[PDB]
Design a protein around this ligand. Structure first.
Ligand SMILES: CCCCCCCCCCCCCCCCCC(=O)OC[C@H](COP(=O)([O-])OCC[N+](C)(C)C)OC(=O)CCCCCCCCCCCCCCCCC
Ligand SMILES: CCCCCCCCCCCCCCCCCC(=O)OC[C@H](COP(=O)(O)OCCN)OC(=O)CCCCCCCCCCCCCCCCC
Ligand SMILES: CCCCCCCCCCCCCCCCCC(=O)OC[C@H](COP(=O)(O)OCCN)OC(=O)CCCCCCCCCCCCCCCCC
Ligand SMILES: CCCCCCCCCCCCCCCCCC(=O)OC[C@H](COP(=O)(O)OCCN)OC(=O)CCCCCCCCCCCCCCCCC
Ligand SMILES: CCCCCCCCCCCCCCCCCC(=O)OC[C@H](COP(=O)(O)OCCN)OC(=O)CCCCCCCCCCCCCCCCC
Ligand SMILES: CCCCCCCCCCCCO[C@@H]1O[C@H](CO)[C@@H](O[C@H]2O[C@H](CO)[C@@H](O)[C@H](O)[C@H]2O)[C@H](O)[C@H]1O
Ligand SMILES: N=C(N)NC(=N)NCCc1ccc(I)c(Cl)c1
Ligand code: SF4
Ligand code: SF4
Ligand code: SF4
Lengths: 104, 156, 45, 72, 145, 176, 311
């Protein structure tokens, strides 16, 4: 219940500050004074997609602090290094294929 | 009455805040901009007055016109003035901006930036010293201190 | 009387430095790496 | 090739053609501080024209004066 | 330690301004609690101080009067309030203050200095100082057509 | 005679290569840059406490104009128009006539302070030290019109500032 | 009694942000041989108040946005999430004691990029949208190393609980065994918070207003403080005496203050990275090292027999 209250307070206050920031006295009485390819490089797509794939790999590494408590440490250490090495191979592939370049 | 008294104190509060946090947009058109830089430089440190060195036009309260305004430039200057949120003030600095100065009789020069935008303070000199400009900014602060927006609002 | 105008002092002024003076500082690469690895080993232990 | 009507002393208008990050075209549009100095000088005596040179490279005032003085 | 010698100097500025009230008055009026030697005072109430151990530019200063020419200047001080005789000394155009080198008296010199009057009823309004150049014919006041 | 600013071969021995690797990996040159900004934090700043303190100026300073008098109170200006002729900005306008006592004096003496380039050529040209640029630089105004000075304004400036103007002239006139 | 506790976190956070604007200006000033604010209140102590009032009574010039809902959403998300990042922080006791507190902070911080994206959509200008996408690309890129560096540290802590970092560092700060990660962690927080030399949103637009501008600024500076509080806990663990918790709070605050001042110090000292260059600093420098140090920190506790407990 506490976490819900904290979240509700944080965003309710944020909402109140935003609305009052928009509606304050102004003291004036007169009249006040689409879905296409945005010209944006394919390189920026590849960054976001590259981030996603690395983020999915990170999801698999997150259990590592708990996995190190296993008695099957031989298997666990081999699989941890395998996953990270494969992540490094992914980076090496993008790097050597000019996927990390910003020219052209 | 207290109602007038409350208005008098609120005007003081909003005036104090607005003159204590003057964020300038500097149009550095020509040599007068150099003396504006020396006012931000350590000896005078305009930041110590609450005048941040360089604000964006949309976060600005005062436009400083620091140099010659040519005809080619005049439309652009007016566009930036119109995008400034209010309250907005203009400081004209130097003879060129004040009334054309050395180039008053030129075919390509606006004879004073006050033909393009309303001006609150005129700083004389060619260029005004950094200290002279600082005197002008402080004079603008005193002008804001004299505003009585809320007093006039409640007598409407 | 005598002509009095701004002049250098008799004998001239003292020497004025102008050459770049970025003094050498710190340890060599070997020593710096040694201290860093030494910190890691103590930390690990 | 994207085109920008202004990117980045005085005031400059830079019209640039981009392709991603790379600049393909850079077309400066100057004259935003053209004040007809050379024409005004024709209406001045040689002494009266001297202060116009302070206001050219207005960071190098006395060097500008020197060049004009040497010429005269 | 020097930290103690620094703190003592801080405390002597309080007594050097005449207790806490005087120390706070200069803190809020001038944002500076330095103590200097009193060079003199002008007829308007401005006081002029020096401290030659400060670096050039900070070695002379003025604490403005709280009232000048009928204006409350407790908070609203101005650089134009310095009268000419002290103006020369304050801006370091000379080494000797008007108390040691008084200005030359003249019958026409303003006996009362005025600060910047822009924005007030005393402001200057320009106008042409020459008389009319062409005189118009005035027709006769009697009839005869 | 010339020198090369950037013509040097890095040493390729192991000690030197390891020095540059340590710089690359341990950011030593960046840390050295942090040292310099740290030393400035502990230096006394150069700011002066304006308007209670003022920047230093010299007697030659070219500021606000003023029209001067003789000790008797007579105006020095005799409407010679040398200042008007020399003014690079055509900022001065003068009319003159015989005064009621026959004196050669001005009826108009205007300086458009928004045309003026504060060059001081007028005070060089004046044969009688009548027009000067004074020491005042704190005369900004709220309107353009206030900066169009007529003779009454300029005479008032002279009577206002003469004490300081005379002393400044006394300090510099031997260089003129 | 718990609502009192929430307010006694929110209000000091907002006040600390306000006066960080003063401190940043004065520290930058003295490193620039000047003073910074010293007129508005004694030693500029009223400057944050004058700025806050000024901004809120300023005209809220919002151009006709392409999405009213997304214009309002972005500042609410930014500020709401920024305050949420503080509720699991042990100082020494957290407001909310989460078993997976470290993971909660990682997950919430990953959502903060939506405020950048939504504000880009709402601007109704392809130029600002392109600026938003460049900022998003920088932010997600440096999220990769922050997560992996954090994981590597936790392999010495043993859990995702934030208070367990306190226990892990009872004898020694984690910066000693892990100063290589602390180095890249620290730089990553700079790039994450778009701080110089990674302040490319400000620099590129050079080459929002009033209250809504103020709110984005508050959220940014709340994040800056929180990041440095996190760094202190992660690498400079303060000892906790259960009978004198305020000694922990004093020492831990000083470390966080100093770390925050080092953000201002760095801003005063260096030029700005080009966009492609800060992308290469991540993908071609930090990430290779972080991956290798991640492999090393999985192996090290196993090979030394120094696996931490789960509980
Ligand atoms: C939340 C509310 C916080 C209100 C803060 C009020 C600020 C107090 C203040 O005005 O500073 C002293 C100021 C100091 O006066 P000052 O602004 O004229 O300062 C003069 C000193 N120099 C020359 C260095 C600038 O008091 C006033 O200006 C009088 C107006 C008071 C405004 C508040 C009224 C309510
Ligand atoms: C016994 C077994 C042990 C095994 C493990 C041993 C490991 C120890 C040895 C390895 C040391 C690893 C060092 C980790 C830090 C990261 C190093 C690094 O990435 O530096 C290189 C990077 C780019 O280098 P660059 O000059 O551009 O050239 C490379 C491209 N050709 O350059 C940079 O990143 C520069 C940083 C730019 C940002 C500048 C602003 C920050 C400067 C101030 C930082 C202060 C220090 C931070 C401390 C934080 C404390 C919390
Ligand atoms: C378009 C607008 C977009 C705006 C999005 C902005 C996001 C705002 C943040 C959303 C909130 C998500 C809530 C995530 C909380 C997860 C934290 C957690 O796991 O712990 C909280 C608590 C369990 O605590 P824990 O210690 O982990 O385990 C129990 C005791 N061992 O678990 C609980 O307390 C249970 C709470 C269940 C209710 C969560 C509902 C979330 C819905 C959010 C939408
Ligand atoms: C190269 C430049 C890089 C600049 C980056 C910025 C770095 C800022 C560093 C901030 C941290 C400085 C530490 C401040 C100390 C705070 C005062 C204090 O209480 O120190 C106590 C500490 C020993 O006590 P303690 O911290 O509790 O350690 C026990 C292990 N848990 O003290 C004993 O050591
Ligand atoms: C402490 C040191 C002590 C010294 C003694 C230690 C001895 C044992 C270690 C020896 C290891 C030597 C292997 C070094 C390989 C270097 C390869 C290389 O130099 O390639 C550089 C180049 C990328 O550089 P770039 O600037 O983009 O292009 C070149 C144009 N100038 O070409 C490339 O494309 C780079 C290769 C692709 C990217 C590889 C990514 C590596 C994998 C990332 C994870 C890191 C490793 C696993 C974790
Ligand atoms: C943080 C709490 C602070 C509490 C302070 C409460 C004070 C309440 C009084 C508010 C006074 C605002 O004062 C007023 O602000 C608005 C900002 O849009 C300004 O701008 C307004 O008026 C001008 C014309 O005058 C219009 O062109 C403009 O579109 C309009 O927004 C006004 O010029 C200013 O007079
Ligand atoms: N970058 C700086 N430190 N100076 C600066 N421009 N600050 C911004 C001023 C500010 C913004 C929001 C709030 I809420 C407050 Cl109180 C003050
Ligand atoms: S007024 Fe003088 S200094 Fe200023 S821009 Fe014009 S010529 Fe240059
Ligand atoms: S200072 Fe120069 S520009 Fe001004 S009036 Fe005198 S001669 Fe003319
Ligand atoms: S001020 Fe001097 S130069 Fe000018 S008209 Fe008068 S006497 Fe002649």
């Amino acid at each position: 219940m506490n976490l819900m209250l904290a979240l509700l307070t944080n965003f309710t206050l944020a909402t109140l500050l935003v609305i009052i920031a928009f509606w304050l006295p102004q003291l004036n009485v007169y009249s006040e004074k689409g879905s296409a390819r945005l010209p944006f490089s394919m390189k920026f797509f590849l960054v976001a997609i590259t981030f996603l794939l690395f983020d999915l790999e990170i999801a698999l590494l997150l259990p590592l602090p708990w996995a190190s408590q296993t008695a099957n440490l031989n298997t666990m250490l081999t699989m941890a290094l395998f996953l990270i090495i494969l992540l490094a191979v992914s980076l090496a592939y993008e790097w050597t294929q000019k996927g990390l370049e910003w020219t052209e | 009455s207290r109602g007038e008294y409350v208005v008098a104190k609120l005007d003081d509060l909003i005036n104090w805040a607005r003159r204590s946090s003057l964020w300038p947009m500097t149009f550095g058109l020509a040599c007068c901009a150099v003396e504006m830089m020396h006012m931000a430089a350590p000896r005078y440190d305009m930041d110590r007055f609450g005048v941040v060195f360089r604000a964006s036009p949309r976060q600005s309260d005062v436009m400083i016109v620091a140099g010659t305004l040519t005809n080619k430039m005049a439309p652009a200057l007016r566009k930036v003035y119109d995008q400034m949120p209010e309250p907005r003030y203009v400081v004209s600095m130097g003879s060129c901006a004040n009334g054309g100065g050395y180039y008053h009789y030129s075919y390509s020069v606006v004879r004073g930036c006050d033909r393009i935008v309303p001006v609150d303070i005129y700083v004389p000199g060619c260029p005004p010293t950094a200290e002279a400009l600082l005197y002008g900014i402080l004079q603008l602060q005193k002008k804001i201190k004299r505003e009585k927006r809320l007093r006039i609002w409640y007598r409407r | 009387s005598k002509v009095k105008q701004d002049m250098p002092p008799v004998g001239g002024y003292g020497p004025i430095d102008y050459k770049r003076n970025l003094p050498r500082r710190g340890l060599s690469g070997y020593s710096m790496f040694a201290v860093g690895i030494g910190a890691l080993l103590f930390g690990y232990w | 090739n994207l085109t920008l009507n202004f990117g980045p002393h005085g005031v400059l208008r830079l019209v640039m053609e981009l392709s991603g990050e790379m600049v393909r075209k850079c077309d400066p549009h100057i004259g935003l501080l053209h004040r007809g100095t050379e024409k005004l000088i024709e209406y001045k005596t040689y002494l009266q024209a001297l202060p116009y040179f302070d206001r050219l490279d207005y960071v190098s005032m006395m060097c500008n004066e020197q060049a004009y003085s040497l010429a005269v | 330690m020097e930290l103690l010698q620094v703190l003592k100097r801080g405390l002597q500025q309080v007594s050097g301004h005449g207790g806490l009230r005087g120390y706070l008055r200069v803190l809020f009026r001038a944002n500076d609690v330095r103590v200097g030697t009193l060079v003199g005072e002008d007829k308007y109430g401005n006081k002029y101080y020096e401290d030659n151990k400060q670096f050039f530019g900070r070695h002379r200063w003025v604490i403005y009067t709280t009232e000048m020419n009928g204006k409350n200047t407790f908070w609203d001080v101005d650089g134009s309030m310095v009268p000419p005789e002290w103006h020369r000394w304050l801006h370091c155009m000379t080494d000797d203050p008007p108390t040691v080198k008084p200005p030359t008296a003249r019958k026409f010199i303003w006996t009362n200095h005025k600060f910047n009057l822009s924005g007030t009823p005393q402001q200057y309004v320009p106008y042409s100082t020459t008389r009319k150049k062409i005189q118009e014919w005035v027709p006769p006041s009697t009839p005869y057509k | 005679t010339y020198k090369y600013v950037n013509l040097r071969e890095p040493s390729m021995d192991m000690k030197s290569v390891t020095d540059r690797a340590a710089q690359t990996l341990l950011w030593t040159e960046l840390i050295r840059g942090l040292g310099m900004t740290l030393s400035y934090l502990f230096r006394e700043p150069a700011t002066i406490n304006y308007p209670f303190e003022k920047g230093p100026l010299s007697p030659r300073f070219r500021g606000e104009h003023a029209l001067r008098r003789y000790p008797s109170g007579e105006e020095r200006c005799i409407a010679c128009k040398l200042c008007e002729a020399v003014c690079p900005a055509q900022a001065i306008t003068i009319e003159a006539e015989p005064r009621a006592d026959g004196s050669r004096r001005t009826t108009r003496y205007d300086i458009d302070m928004t045309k003026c380039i504060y060059c001081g050529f007028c005070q060089e040209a004046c044969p009688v030290d009548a027009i000067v640029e004074g020491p005042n630089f704190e005369f900004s105004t709220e309107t353009h019109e206030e900066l169009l000075y007529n003779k009454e304004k300029l005479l008032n400036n002279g009577d206002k500032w003469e004490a300081e103007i005379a002393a400044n002239i006394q300090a510099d006139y031997l260089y003129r | 009694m718990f609502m009192i506790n929430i307010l006694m976190l929110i209000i000091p956070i907002l006040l600390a942000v306000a006066f960080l604007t003063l401190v940043e200006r004065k520290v930058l000033g003295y490193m620039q041989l000047r003073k910074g604010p010293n007129v508005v209140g004694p030693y500029g102590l009223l400057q944050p108040i004058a700025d806050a009032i000024k901004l809120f009574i300023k005209e809220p010039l919002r151009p006709a946005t392409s999405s009213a809902s997304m214009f309002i959403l972005a500042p609410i998300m930014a500020l709401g999430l920024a305050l949420t990042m503080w509720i699991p922080l042990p100082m020494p006791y957290p407001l909310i004691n989460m078993n997976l507190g470290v993971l909660f902070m990682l997950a919430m911080s990953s959502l903060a990029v939506y405020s950048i994206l939504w504000s880009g959509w709402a601007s109704n200008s392809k130029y600002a949208l392109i600026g938003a996408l460049r900022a998003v690309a920088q932010t997600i890129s440096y999220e990769v190393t922050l997560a992996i560096i954090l994981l590597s540290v936790l392999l010495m802590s043993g859990s995702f609980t934030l208070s367990t970092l306190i226990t892990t560092q009872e004898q020694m700060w984690l910066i000693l065994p892990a100063w290589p990660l602390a180095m890249m962690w620290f730089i990553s927080t700079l790039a994450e918070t778009n701080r110089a030399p990674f302040d490319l949103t400000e620099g590129e637009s050079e080459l929002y207003a009033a209250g809504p501008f103020a709110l984005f600024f508050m959220a940014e500076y709340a994040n800056i403080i929180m990041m440095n509080i996190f760094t202190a806990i992660l690498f400079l663990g303060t000892s906790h005496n259960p009978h004198m918790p305020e000694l922990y709070t004093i020492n831990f605050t000083i470390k966080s203050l100093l770390l925050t001042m080092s953000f201002l110090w760095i801003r005063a000292s260096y030029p700005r990275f080009r966009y492609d260059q800060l992308m290469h600093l991540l993908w071609k420098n930090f990430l290779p090292l972080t991956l290798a140090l991640c492999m090393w920190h999985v192996s090290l506790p196993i090979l030394t027999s120094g696996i931490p407990p789960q509980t």
